[PDB]
């Protein structure tokens, strides 16, 4: 079974800067028919892989010429001349010289861009959910860079702990930012014995922490 091995990138790639991804096979990919069956696929977040380069160096239809491929035998390289926002994702090599078809483990390409502060929004629990006996309070951090961000929930200015969960999106393929949602979950009981619900956000693009808040049952 031919084993394909890729090299990880050591750091995100700045927009506009070149990138190179390398792939090696455990034996030559030169087929007896004269072809070398090494292809490159890119998988953007949530999407299926898409073919970029086939037979070492050929660009599949509609692939921009900033992508190129080179190599021979057991050593191959995908090169992006100038990395664009849409290039974020995971790049895979695959061999088709022998069965089973096999893939490299993937190389992740992350984009480095300028600092971007999050826009912050707080959402009270809906009245429909309160009827069910639980209150979800949601805090949204929208389009920020870099990924590192701290969200702290406060209820009547008391720091919350152990009752929230957060989720972060993958890097955006258009502006290279992240977004984050944090959900604070209380019973209707605990929710209705307090007034002020605050989400306080720390992040490199904020001069000082930003708080968004609401008062229960006010416009």
């Amino acid at each position: 079974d031919i084993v394909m091995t890729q090299t990880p990138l050591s750091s995100p790639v700045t927009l506009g800067q070149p990138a190179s991804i390398s792939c090696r096979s455990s034996q030559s990919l030169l087929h007896s028919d004269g072809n070398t069956y090494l292809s490159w696929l890119q998988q953007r977040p949530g999407q299926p892989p898409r073919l970029l380069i086939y037979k070492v160096s050929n660009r599949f239809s509609e692939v921009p010429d900033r992508f190129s491929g080179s190599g021979a035998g057991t050593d191959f390289t995908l090169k992006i001349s100038r990395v664009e926002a849409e290039d974020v994702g995971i790049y895979y090599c695959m061999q088709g010289t022998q069965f089973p078809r096999t893939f490299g483990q993937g190389t992740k390409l992350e984009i480095e861009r300028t600092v971007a502060a999050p826009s912050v929004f707080i959402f009270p629990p809906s009245d429909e959910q309160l009827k069910s006996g639980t209150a979800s309070v949601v805090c949204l951090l929208n389009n920020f860079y870099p990924r590192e961000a701290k969200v702290q929930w406060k209820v009547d200015n008391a720091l919350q702990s152990g009752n929230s969960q957060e989720s972060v999106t993958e890097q955006d393929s258009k502006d290279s930012t992240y977004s984050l949602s944090s959900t604070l979950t209380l019973s209707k009981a605990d929710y209705e014995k307090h007034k002020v619900y605050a989400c306080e956000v720390t992040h490199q693009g904020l001069s000082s922490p930003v708080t968004k808040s609401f008062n229960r049952g006010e416009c």
Partner: peptide, 18 residues
């Protein structure tokens, strides 16, 4: 932005889409 689902302590998922 449709966020990755989080697994709650109940073993059930929840996600938001904004």
């Amino acid at each position: 932005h449709t966020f990755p689902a989080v697994l709650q302590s109940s073993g059930l998922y929840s996600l938001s889409s904004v």
